[PDB]
Amino acid sequence: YSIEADKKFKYSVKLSDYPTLQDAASAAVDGLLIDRDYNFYGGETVDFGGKVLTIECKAKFIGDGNLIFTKLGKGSRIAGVFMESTTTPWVIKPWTDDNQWLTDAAAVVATLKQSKTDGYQPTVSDYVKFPGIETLLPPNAKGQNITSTLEIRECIGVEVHRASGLMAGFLFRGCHFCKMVDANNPSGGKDGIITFENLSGDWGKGNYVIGGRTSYGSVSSAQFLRNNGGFERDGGVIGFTSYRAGGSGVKTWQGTVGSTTSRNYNLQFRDSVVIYPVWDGFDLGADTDRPGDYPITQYPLHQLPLNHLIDNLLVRGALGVGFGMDGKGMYVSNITVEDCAGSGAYLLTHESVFTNIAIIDTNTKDFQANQIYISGACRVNGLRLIGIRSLTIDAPNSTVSGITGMVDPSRINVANLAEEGLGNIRANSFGYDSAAIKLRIHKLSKTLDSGALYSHINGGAGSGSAYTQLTAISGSTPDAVSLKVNHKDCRGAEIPFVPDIASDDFIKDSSCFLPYWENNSTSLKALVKKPNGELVRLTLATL
Amino acid sequence: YSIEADKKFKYSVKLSDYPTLQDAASAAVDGLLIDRDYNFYGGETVDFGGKVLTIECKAKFIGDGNLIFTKLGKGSRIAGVFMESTTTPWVIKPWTDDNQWLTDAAAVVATLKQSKTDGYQPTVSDYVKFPGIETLLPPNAKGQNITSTLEIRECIGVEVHRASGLMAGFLFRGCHFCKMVDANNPSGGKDGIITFENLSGDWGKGNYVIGGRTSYGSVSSAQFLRNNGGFERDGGVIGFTSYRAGGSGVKTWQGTVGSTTSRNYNLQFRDSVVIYPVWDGFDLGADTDRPGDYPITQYPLHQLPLNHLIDNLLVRGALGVGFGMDGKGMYVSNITVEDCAGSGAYLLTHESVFTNIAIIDTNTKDFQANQIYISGACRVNGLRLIGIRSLTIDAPNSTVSGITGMVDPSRINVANLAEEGLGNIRANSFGYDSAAIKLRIHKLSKTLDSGALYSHINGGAGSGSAYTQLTAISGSTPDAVSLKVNHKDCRGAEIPFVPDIASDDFIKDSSCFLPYWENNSTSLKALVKKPNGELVRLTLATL
Amino acid sequence: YSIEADKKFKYSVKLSDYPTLQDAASAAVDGLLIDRDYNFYGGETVDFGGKVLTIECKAKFIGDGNLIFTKLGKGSRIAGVFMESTTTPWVIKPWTDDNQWLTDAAAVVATLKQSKTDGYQPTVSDYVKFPGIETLLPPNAKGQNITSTLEIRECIGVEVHRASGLMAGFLFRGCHFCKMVDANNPSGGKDGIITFENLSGDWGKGNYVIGGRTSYGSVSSAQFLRNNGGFERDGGVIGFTSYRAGGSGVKTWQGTVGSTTSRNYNLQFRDSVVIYPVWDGFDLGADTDRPGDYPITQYPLHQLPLNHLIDNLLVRGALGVGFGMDGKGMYVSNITVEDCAGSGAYLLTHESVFTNIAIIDTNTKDFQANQIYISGACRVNGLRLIGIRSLTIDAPNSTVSGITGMVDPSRINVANLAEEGLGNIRANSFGYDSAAIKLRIHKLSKTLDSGALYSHINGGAGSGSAYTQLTAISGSTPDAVSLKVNHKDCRGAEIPFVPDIASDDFIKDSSCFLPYWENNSTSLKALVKKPNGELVRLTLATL
């Protein structure tokens, strides 16, 4: 029977049969079932002997610190892992029962409680975020470092599915072709919830966060260090949701970490949502002179050819910036940012294109100077601004087309704004006695319209009569001078004349005449520039 | 060997070895394989003893009524379950071979057949949908109640994957943190296909419909009762497809069910598609005085702070309304609705913002008064209307910006419509001898333009000549009065004058003159309002 | 014990215990583990006896040609399969280290190397793509046909999950309700990477490509032949990514293959991305007289009622066309195409609607005559054009509304272009001394504006003064004739007069006067069309 049993049954060892995880790992052939809670010590390392194992978790890994998995064979899968710390730290909860953010240090300190969730451990970033909190926090609430972390070290082709936990972290160190799939809402600890770190060895490639969600955590939910997806864009974050990150929802590191670059290139950031991060929704910048990366002589600061594939992202409720990035030659599309306390978008980009961007009700707390900032020479095609709630857009070197929304024109600063390809147009006016097409030359004034074409009701509704007026500003008084057609249904044109003797220089073109007033004779005269260019003054109207 | 076998093999019991499902459940340790069809009786209940089981289905559960699963441990998964009724009911199929909807009661009654799919069992909702059908339906086709339902009762953390069936239903009763994942197109029965009902106990939380699709069913495909995802928005429908729901594709219940509220808050509704529902695509309203919920004194009817996260939804072919909802303070984005028989959007919302909405060819059967209705004070930023086919938009209290499409202006009713931030503009005219910029004051007339700026060809194509004309309406005749520049390439301005003696009140501004006709002397006179405001009549032109 | 063991353990056979795959298949009951590499011969066929098996792959299937799986029971799943050829062919790599496409045949021939990846085997399509390459390629690099293919033949309800490979292909022949799920980036061979072919038997239905990605391959990444998803749209490609297809990313075949139709209907193509295909991103056409399909008498060429559900697609970097299709009565939405060498969109459609389309920087290599082409009578609602880089749009029979972007108006050709529903308007000018609203009648001239309304600064910035001017083109000189209001802050209107004796026909309307010059008397005269329609010439101004 043994011969037969050995050939007809599925192989699997279970943790309940061993004293240590390494013993179970050593006995494993195909499957490994975690069927009893396991308390690990920080730094406990397991060697899986290069075996391609299917690890099914039905219990917890309990401990502060890192549980290190090494030598897992390509194709290994770990499903249902649940990490939980032994320590219950002091956490702050910077929001109210009405879901309003608390910005006052004293109010935030008042939220202090010991829990493994529904808040996060304060870190130095909070000292900046809630000024004065550093001196108000009790000593036992400062410098905490609690995270129960599953560290996958130097493995290739390992996937972690439906992971969860309390004060949990997942670290892929020196890994390639690894994925964090369908994270089952783990509640974060002190470190990043999902981290792909490749500071040593080759640049990380094939590393993804696919689907799922995370909650809380003191720093960023998903973060990458020294990863390059190649032209194939093999890596990134797709279909992910981050809620209440103590740092940012999704972050590509910037600058030098250690003696090398922590920057990232050629990754995908698509179909993801970030809600209520304490800092930013998406922080995709690379610069904060670049050991291990391109020299400043090759690419100036904020001008690296990051080449990320960015599309279909939604951000709501950030206490910081909704969407931030830098780089040169980027194509970004379909970004929607709503209800943010700081800027909706902070873009240190150059020679980049932004298509179909919607920034709705941002910088609600005036943390920044604008709702959307673009530093370099960029192109914006389709920009929706203003929801239901300081410049709105400050992109001094950018050319923009297609803005929609109830924006205040005096709060727009761009290099060029134009609608070159509209068809025949109709201006529909509702709730007013007039319809208008206004012109504003920002060089003359950002606050006053310089001229206009209006249509005004004669009499009342259903009168079947209106008058058209063409105006010009004079003496900083909009519509100061104007020509009318059909005022009071008179069916004639009312023409403005120079109130005094017209100077020779008032007339512009040949074969034109300019009426002027001669008070001493109660006459209308006409300064005429003949077809040949010569001036002559004629009598136009008299008693 | 037994000692060794017990430690090296995967544990799993199979249904073929037991007479009842409970016996198999009692013997189960890790896995449970459903390897033979099992006929269950309505109400048959299985107690899984709190065990964390992995149930793999490779056969069917056959029976009318509910098969009840209880006491499954957190982390349990059921994959490949297939529910099928024992009864083959009478179903109607309200659409043609060309996929046209049938709206006539007699034509619908003519479709009657006995089948477990390709149609649905008529219910009272059909009496409203196809008027007169109640009296035309044969008695054996009325009041049927066939559904083979898998009911998961009062469990936490249980996931159902790749479920399917015929006349199938999936009910999560009093569950939390449960998910219906990748539904493998089950064909529905009389009740909802996927239901998260939490009328008793705590409000449902962590309940999701992730991916997959469903077909048919008499009522809604996915529905929620008394669920609240919290600020974390932990719950909802993401990446789902519903086809031909006899009710609505996705529905959050409204009103009182029993003695409590069936309403829902803080859920996500994203990246989903609803096609051909008999009623609505997405019905996300909460109100139809609120036991178990906010009193009317706190929040008036249709003004609850639902706070759902709604984004990236597509609806096509609804016989009812494409997208419907109510609530106050909502942010809704990226909704696309096409080819619907009733309104594309029916919005009983207040103080809400709608960004990038596309309503294309809706209310094709005139079931409603408009294509899009908004009751309260809302903001719409980006609205695409008209495809290739009664008001189009009736949002009396809303402010709108950015409408695109071949809309008839007389069919637009809004509080305010404006394009405040456009750049320099060009009106490009194709197929006509003129280009135009028209003005329409809806208060004066919704059907006639009040004034215009035109450019008209002089001669023909390639003439290099055109004339510009500024017009005004008089006597309900658009363009009745006008000033021209370069008519017939004459290079002069043609000016309209009052056809009779101008009354003193015809002139508006000081330092302006208004030409008028004096027929008795064949002279042109000029009513002049001097710079000082005094009137004087002068002779302008004479023989 | 045997009795007990037989009832408590999971059944699974492993390949290591058998000499052939068929032997393992014959012994299988529930699970089948591929735990050792298996070299198969082309055409090796395995009969699974109708068993519902769960095949877990932890090793490779090695061989050139097809490994054929037949008689798998409904519900069978194959996970982690890895196909690899025995031959290492000669591949070309038509792109540089800077990711620039190589278009020169000699440069492409220079890239030749033997590898199972990072390039593809040349085929006849390359002879067209890189002209002259056919004569430059060495004989050993021509006509190669290496693909290690897993062929699932005539099965129903079989799913392949997390498949991968090198020079790999996956062929579903005569299958229904089958899915290719989460493809783990297999590197393609000579044939299509994922193919659903239903040339024999019933039209394919229920076949999907869900999630995942593929890289390289000589032809199309995902392709369908004779599939019809029905009104339920049961089938298609959702959430998929294709990188560097030697052919197109996603393709529905056109024309006759063998003696029957290879066309497809009622499929879904949503939430997918195609990057860097050698040919097209999405090729969804059906026509290239239709055996096995609709006769030309019923539906003319390019006018089949395909009825696909198309939404939310992104294409970047195609060497060919970004998005192509044909058909009649189609609704297409939310398409984004960026940085393509050939047309962004090539649409042989009629009576179809396109909503929210963005074509950004396409036809960069002038391969086509335009960036977007539409042949038939279609409607486009929302069209974004131009990024940061020959007509732009040529849609002679289409009506368009809502174009945004820095488009050159002379490069637009449409049947009708209009913005019927805009509200009150403001034209904001940045960087210039004037703001303008221009009119262009394309029938008169596609390159010159026919008239304009300008506002120009008087003096300098902060002067609080500007002049408004209304112009008209004459003698092909834009703005040749004009009326001004407030030039040089004179507060009067400058009026142009006919430079010579005005002909009777110059005046258009009754009750209007047209000033004209009489050089011989240094007088301004006025051609007056009296209220009764009679002409009279009067003296207007004199010395």
PDB file of N, CA and C in Angstrom, chain A residues 402-462:
ATOM      1  N   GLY A 402      -8.325  73.445 -23.643  1.00  0.00           N
ATOM      2  CA  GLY A 402      -9.436  72.662 -23.104  1.00  0.00           C
ATOM      3  C   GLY A 402      -9.768  72.672 -21.628  1.00  0.00           C
ATOM      4  N   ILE A 403      -9.686  73.836 -21.000  1.00  0.00           N
ATOM      5  CA  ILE A 403     -10.050  73.960 -19.593  1.00  0.00           C
ATOM      6  C   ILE A 403     -11.579  74.027 -19.492  1.00  0.00           C
ATOM      7  N   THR A 404     -12.147  73.276 -18.549  1.00  0.00           N
ATOM      8  CA  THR A 404     -13.589  73.336 -18.289  1.00  0.00           C
ATOM      9  C   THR A 404     -13.758  73.566 -16.788  1.00  0.00           C
ATOM     10  N   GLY A 405     -14.848  74.229 -16.409  1.00  0.00           N
ATOM     11  CA  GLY A 405     -15.096  74.491 -15.004  1.00  0.00           C
ATOM     12  C   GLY A 405     -15.250  75.970 -14.691  1.00  0.00           C
ATOM     13  N   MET A 406     -15.795  76.235 -13.507  1.00  0.00           N
ATOM     14  CA  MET A 406     -16.063  77.590 -13.039  1.00  0.00           C
ATOM     15  C   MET A 406     -14.834  78.256 -12.423  1.00  0.00           C
ATOM     16  N   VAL A 407     -13.750  78.280 -13.187  1.00  0.00           N
ATOM     17  CA  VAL A 407     -12.498  78.858 -12.732  1.00  0.00           C
ATOM     18  C   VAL A 407     -12.552  80.397 -12.761  1.00  0.00           C
ATOM     19  N   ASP A 408     -11.849  81.028 -11.821  1.00  0.00           N
ATOM     20  CA  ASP A 408     -11.745  82.485 -11.765  1.00  0.00           C
ATOM     21  C   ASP A 408     -10.551  82.745 -12.706  1.00  0.00           C
ATOM     22  N   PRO A 409     -10.769  83.467 -13.826  1.00  0.00           N
ATOM     23  CA  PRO A 409      -9.689  83.746 -14.788  1.00  0.00           C
ATOM     24  C   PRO A 409      -8.449  84.454 -14.225  1.00  0.00           C
ATOM     25  N   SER A 410      -8.640  85.263 -13.185  1.00  0.00           N
ATOM     26  CA  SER A 410      -7.536  85.992 -12.568  1.00  0.00           C
ATOM     27  C   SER A 410      -6.592  85.043 -11.835  1.00  0.00           C
ATOM     28  N   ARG A 411      -7.023  83.801 -11.640  1.00  0.00           N
ATOM     29  CA  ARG A 411      -6.218  82.816 -10.937  1.00  0.00           C
ATOM     30  C   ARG A 411      -5.561  81.798 -11.868  1.00  0.00           C
ATOM     31  N   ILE A 412      -5.459  82.146 -13.146  1.00  0.00           N
ATOM     32  CA  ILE A 412      -4.829  81.269 -14.117  1.00  0.00           C
ATOM     33  C   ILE A 412      -3.544  81.922 -14.607  1.00  0.00           C
ATOM     34  N   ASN A 413      -2.434  81.192 -14.557  1.00  0.00           N
ATOM     35  CA  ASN A 413      -1.174  81.705 -15.088  1.00  0.00           C
ATOM     36  C   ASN A 413      -0.542  80.583 -15.917  1.00  0.00           C
ATOM     37  N   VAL A 414      -0.492  80.776 -17.233  1.00  0.00           N
ATOM     38  CA  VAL A 414       0.084  79.804 -18.166  1.00  0.00           C
ATOM     39  C   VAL A 414       0.845  80.602 -19.214  1.00  0.00           C
ATOM     40  N   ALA A 415       1.631  79.923 -20.047  1.00  0.00           N
ATOM     41  CA  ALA A 415       2.399  80.604 -21.096  1.00  0.00           C
ATOM     42  C   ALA A 415       1.487  80.925 -22.271  1.00  0.00           C
ATOM     43  N   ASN A 416       0.624  79.976 -22.620  1.00  0.00           N
ATOM     44  CA  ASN A 416      -0.287  80.170 -23.739  1.00  0.00           C
ATOM     45  C   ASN A 416      -1.532  79.319 -23.510  1.00  0.00           C
ATOM     46  N   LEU A 417      -2.695  79.897 -23.796  1.00  0.00           N
ATOM     47  CA  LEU A 417      -3.989  79.237 -23.633  1.00  0.00           C
ATOM     48  C   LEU A 417      -4.760  79.448 -24.945  1.00  0.00           C
ATOM     49  N   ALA A 418      -5.199  78.362 -25.588  1.00  0.00           N
ATOM     50  CA  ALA A 418      -5.905  78.513 -26.870  1.00  0.00           C
ATOM     51  C   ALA A 418      -6.794  77.350 -27.259  1.00  0.00           C
ATOM     52  N   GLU A 419      -7.861  77.676 -27.990  1.00  0.00           N
ATOM     53  CA  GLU A 419      -8.837  76.716 -28.506  1.00  0.00           C
ATOM     54  C   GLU A 419      -8.791  76.977 -30.015  1.00  0.00           C
ATOM     55  N   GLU A 420      -7.815  76.359 -30.672  1.00  0.00           N
ATOM     56  CA  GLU A 420      -7.584  76.523 -32.109  1.00  0.00           C
ATOM     57  C   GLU A 420      -8.579  75.842 -33.035  1.00  0.00           C
ATOM     58  N   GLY A 421      -9.147  74.721 -32.586  1.00  0.00           N
ATOM     59  CA  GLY A 421     -10.041  73.955 -33.435  1.00  0.00           C
ATOM     60  C   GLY A 421     -11.505  73.821 -33.071  1.00  0.00           C
ATOM     61  N   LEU A 422     -12.142  74.894 -32.611  1.00  0.00           N
ATOM     62  CA  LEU A 422     -13.570  74.813 -32.284  1.00  0.00           C
ATOM     63  C   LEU A 422     -14.365  75.007 -33.569  1.00  0.00           C
ATOM     64  N   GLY A 423     -15.618  74.580 -33.587  1.00  0.00           N
ATOM     65  CA  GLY A 423     -16.416  74.759 -34.785  1.00  0.00           C
ATOM     66  C   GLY A 423     -17.238  76.028 -34.624  1.00  0.00           C
ATOM     67  N   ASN A 424     -18.359  76.110 -35.335  1.00  0.00           N
ATOM     68  CA  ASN A 424     -19.259  77.246 -35.175  1.00  0.00           C
ATOM     69  C   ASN A 424     -19.698  77.208 -33.700  1.00  0.00           C
ATOM     70  N   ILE A 425     -19.848  78.382 -33.102  1.00  0.00           N
ATOM     71  CA  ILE A 425     -20.127  78.484 -31.675  1.00  0.00           C
ATOM     72  C   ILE A 425     -21.415  79.155 -31.266  1.00  0.00           C
ATOM     73  N   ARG A 426     -22.014  78.666 -30.187  1.00  0.00           N
ATOM     74  CA  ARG A 426     -23.174  79.332 -29.620  1.00  0.00           C
ATOM     75  C   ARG A 426     -22.944  79.519 -28.110  1.00  0.00           C
ATOM     76  N   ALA A 427     -23.097  80.758 -27.639  1.00  0.00           N
ATOM     77  CA  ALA A 427     -22.967  81.079 -26.221  1.00  0.00           C
ATOM     78  C   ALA A 427     -24.397  81.135 -25.673  1.00  0.00           C
ATOM     79  N   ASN A 428     -24.721  80.196 -24.793  1.00  0.00           N
ATOM     80  CA  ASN A 428     -26.048  80.105 -24.202  1.00  0.00           C
ATOM     81  C   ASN A 428     -26.046  80.688 -22.796  1.00  0.00           C
ATOM     82  N   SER A 429     -26.849  81.727 -22.587  1.00  0.00           N
ATOM     83  CA  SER A 429     -26.942  82.372 -21.280  1.00  0.00           C
ATOM     84  C   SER A 429     -28.218  82.022 -20.516  1.00  0.00           C
ATOM     85  N   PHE A 430     -28.036  81.584 -19.271  1.00  0.00           N
ATOM     86  CA  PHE A 430     -29.130  81.184 -18.387  1.00  0.00           C
ATOM     87  C   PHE A 430     -29.131  82.040 -17.138  1.00  0.00           C
ATOM     88  N   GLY A 431     -30.327  82.413 -16.702  1.00  0.00           N
ATOM     89  CA  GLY A 431     -30.477  83.211 -15.502  1.00  0.00           C
ATOM     90  C   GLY A 431     -30.128  84.687 -15.587  1.00  0.00           C
ATOM     91  N   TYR A 432     -29.734  85.165 -16.762  1.00  0.00           N
ATOM     92  CA  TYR A 432     -29.382  86.568 -16.916  1.00  0.00           C
ATOM     93  C   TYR A 432     -30.157  87.210 -18.045  1.00  0.00           C
ATOM     94  N   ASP A 433     -30.135  88.535 -18.037  1.00  0.00           N
ATOM     95  CA  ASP A 433     -30.797  89.329 -19.063  1.00  0.00           C
ATOM     96  C   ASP A 433     -29.867  89.559 -20.250  1.00  0.00           C
ATOM     97  N   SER A 434     -28.682  88.959 -20.206  1.00  0.00           N
ATOM     98  CA  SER A 434     -27.738  89.119 -21.297  1.00  0.00           C
ATOM     99  C   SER A 434     -26.865  87.891 -21.480  1.00  0.00           C
ATOM    100  N   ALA A 435     -26.278  87.782 -22.670  1.00  0.00           N
ATOM    101  CA  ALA A 435     -25.360  86.706 -23.049  1.00  0.00           C
ATOM    102  C   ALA A 435     -24.090  87.480 -23.389  1.00  0.00           C
ATOM    103  N   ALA A 436     -22.936  86.891 -23.117  1.00  0.00           N
ATOM    104  CA  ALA A 436     -21.689  87.586 -23.360  1.00  0.00           C
ATOM    105  C   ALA A 436     -20.532  86.724 -23.788  1.00  0.00           C
ATOM    106  N   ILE A 437     -19.674  87.346 -24.582  1.00  0.00           N
ATOM    107  CA  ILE A 437     -18.443  86.747 -25.059  1.00  0.00           C
ATOM    108  C   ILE A 437     -17.408  87.813 -24.692  1.00  0.00           C
ATOM    109  N   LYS A 438     -16.669  87.552 -23.622  1.00  0.00           N
ATOM    110  CA  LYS A 438     -15.668  88.487 -23.120  1.00  0.00           C
ATOM    111  C   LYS A 438     -14.235  88.174 -23.536  1.00  0.00           C
ATOM    112  N   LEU A 439     -13.428  89.219 -23.634  1.00  0.00           N
ATOM    113  CA  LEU A 439     -12.018  89.084 -23.987  1.00  0.00           C
ATOM    114  C   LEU A 439     -11.186  89.674 -22.841  1.00  0.00           C
ATOM    115  N   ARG A 440     -10.127  88.977 -22.459  1.00  0.00           N
ATOM    116  CA  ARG A 440      -9.258  89.436 -21.387  1.00  0.00           C
ATOM    117  C   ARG A 440      -7.808  89.235 -21.794  1.00  0.00           C
ATOM    118  N   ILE A 441      -7.055  90.331 -21.815  1.00  0.00           N
ATOM    119  CA  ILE A 441      -5.635  90.308 -22.155  1.00  0.00           C
ATOM    120  C   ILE A 441      -4.951  90.343 -20.791  1.00  0.00           C
ATOM    121  N   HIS A 442      -4.396  89.213 -20.371  1.00  0.00           N
ATOM    122  CA  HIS A 442      -3.769  89.114 -19.056  1.00  0.00           C
ATOM    123  C   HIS A 442      -2.565  90.025 -18.852  1.00  0.00           C
ATOM    124  N   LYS A 443      -1.912  90.384 -19.954  1.00  0.00           N
ATOM    125  CA  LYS A 443      -0.775  91.303 -19.937  1.00  0.00           C
ATOM    126  C   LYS A 443      -1.265  92.712 -19.524  1.00  0.00           C
ATOM    127  N   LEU A 444      -2.473  93.076 -19.949  1.00  0.00           N
ATOM    128  CA  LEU A 444      -3.057  94.361 -19.596  1.00  0.00           C
ATOM    129  C   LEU A 444      -3.604  94.304 -18.167  1.00  0.00           C
ATOM    130  N   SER A 445      -4.412  93.278 -17.894  1.00  0.00           N
ATOM    131  CA  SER A 445      -5.011  93.058 -16.581  1.00  0.00           C
ATOM    132  C   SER A 445      -5.512  91.622 -16.429  1.00  0.00           C
ATOM    133  N   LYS A 446      -5.190  91.020 -15.290  1.00  0.00           N
ATOM    134  CA  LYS A 446      -5.627  89.656 -15.003  1.00  0.00           C
ATOM    135  C   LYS A 446      -7.012  89.682 -14.400  1.00  0.00           C
ATOM    136  N   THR A 447      -7.440  90.849 -13.920  1.00  0.00           N
ATOM    137  CA  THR A 447      -8.741  90.975 -13.268  1.00  0.00           C
ATOM    138  C   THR A 447      -9.876  91.663 -14.034  1.00  0.00           C
ATOM    139  N   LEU A 448      -9.549  92.405 -15.084  1.00  0.00           N
ATOM    140  CA  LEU A 448     -10.589  93.108 -15.830  1.00  0.00           C
ATOM    141  C   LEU A 448     -10.653  92.684 -17.278  1.00  0.00           C
ATOM    142  N   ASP A 449     -11.867  92.503 -17.783  1.00  0.00           N
ATOM    143  CA  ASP A 449     -12.029  92.150 -19.191  1.00  0.00           C
ATOM    144  C   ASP A 449     -11.749  93.406 -20.017  1.00  0.00           C
ATOM    145  N   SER A 450     -11.025  93.238 -21.117  1.00  0.00           N
ATOM    146  CA  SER A 450     -10.653  94.365 -21.968  1.00  0.00           C
ATOM    147  C   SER A 450     -11.686  94.761 -23.029  1.00  0.00           C
ATOM    148  N   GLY A 451     -12.566  93.833 -23.369  1.00  0.00           N
ATOM    149  CA  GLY A 451     -13.582  94.116 -24.360  1.00  0.00           C
ATOM    150  C   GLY A 451     -14.623  93.022 -24.312  1.00  0.00           C
ATOM    151  N   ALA A 452     -15.741  93.241 -24.991  1.00  0.00           N
ATOM    152  CA  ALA A 452     -16.798  92.254 -25.002  1.00  0.00           C
ATOM    153  C   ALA A 452     -17.823  92.430 -26.117  1.00  0.00           C
ATOM    154  N   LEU A 453     -18.495  91.325 -26.416  1.00  0.00           N
ATOM    155  CA  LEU A 453     -19.591  91.286 -27.366  1.00  0.00           C
ATOM    156  C   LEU A 453     -20.763  90.779 -26.497  1.00  0.00           C
ATOM    157  N   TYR A 454     -21.770  91.619 -26.303  1.00  0.00           N
ATOM    158  CA  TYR A 454     -22.932  91.254 -25.497  1.00  0.00           C
ATOM    159  C   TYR A 454     -24.196  91.254 -26.319  1.00  0.00           C
ATOM    160  N   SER A 455     -25.213  90.604 -25.780  1.00  0.00           N
ATOM    161  CA  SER A 455     -26.544  90.606 -26.356  1.00  0.00           C
ATOM    162  C   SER A 455     -27.383  90.852 -25.106  1.00  0.00           C
ATOM    163  N   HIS A 456     -28.204  91.900 -25.116  1.00  0.00           N
ATOM    164  CA  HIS A 456     -29.023  92.252 -23.951  1.00  0.00           C
ATOM    165  C   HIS A 456     -30.492  92.322 -24.307  1.00  0.00           C
ATOM    166  N   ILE A 457     -31.355  91.870 -23.396  1.00  0.00           N
ATOM    167  CA  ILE A 457     -32.802  91.908 -23.609  1.00  0.00           C
ATOM    168  C   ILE A 457     -33.333  93.345 -23.689  1.00  0.00           C
ATOM    169  N   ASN A 458     -34.229  93.594 -24.649  1.00  0.00           N
ATOM    170  CA  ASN A 458     -34.903  94.891 -24.791  1.00  0.00           C
ATOM    171  C   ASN A 458     -36.295  94.620 -24.219  1.00  0.00           C
ATOM    172  N   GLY A 459     -36.672  95.343 -23.176  1.00  0.00           N
ATOM    173  CA  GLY A 459     -37.975  95.116 -22.579  1.00  0.00           C
ATOM    174  C   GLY A 459     -37.893  93.957 -21.605  1.00  0.00           C
ATOM    175  N   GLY A 460     -38.580  92.864 -21.903  1.00  0.00           N
ATOM    176  CA  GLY A 460     -38.530  91.729 -21.004  1.00  0.00           C
ATOM    177  C   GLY A 460     -38.563  90.421 -21.754  1.00  0.00           C
ATOM    178  N   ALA A 461     -38.781  89.336 -21.018  1.00  0.00           N
ATOM    179  CA  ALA A 461     -38.852  88.009 -21.613  1.00  0.00           C
ATOM    180  C   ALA A 461     -39.955  87.988 -22.661  1.00  0.00           C
ATOM    181  N   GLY A 462     -39.730  87.206 -23.714  1.00  0.00           N
ATOM    182  CA  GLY A 462     -40.703  87.094 -24.785  1.00  0.00           C
ATOM    183  C   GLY A 462     -40.922  88.361 -25.595  1.00  0.00           C
TER     184      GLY A 462
END
